[PDB]
Amino acid sequence: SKVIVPQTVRLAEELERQQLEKRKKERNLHLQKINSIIDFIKERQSE
């Protein structure tokens, strides 16, 4: 018997409807940036 509503289909539908990218770039991008500044400070002190 066919599975009428697969998991990935429902997940993609919900994701697309909620979307209708920038947030992920901002959050992940800021984390990557704060981390670079932090790794670099751990370098100046050692210098």
Binding site for other proteins (CB under 8 A): 2-3, 6-9, 12-13, 16, 33-34, 36-38, 40-42, 44-45
10 Å Cβ neighbour count for 7?
A: 8
- Shortest Cβ 30–other proteins spacing (Å): 8
CA atoms within 13 A on the CB side of 47: 6
Residue (3 or 24) nearer to other proteins, CB: 3
Greatest distance between any 2 Cα atoms in the chain: 67
- Shortest Cβ 24–other proteins spacing (Å): 15
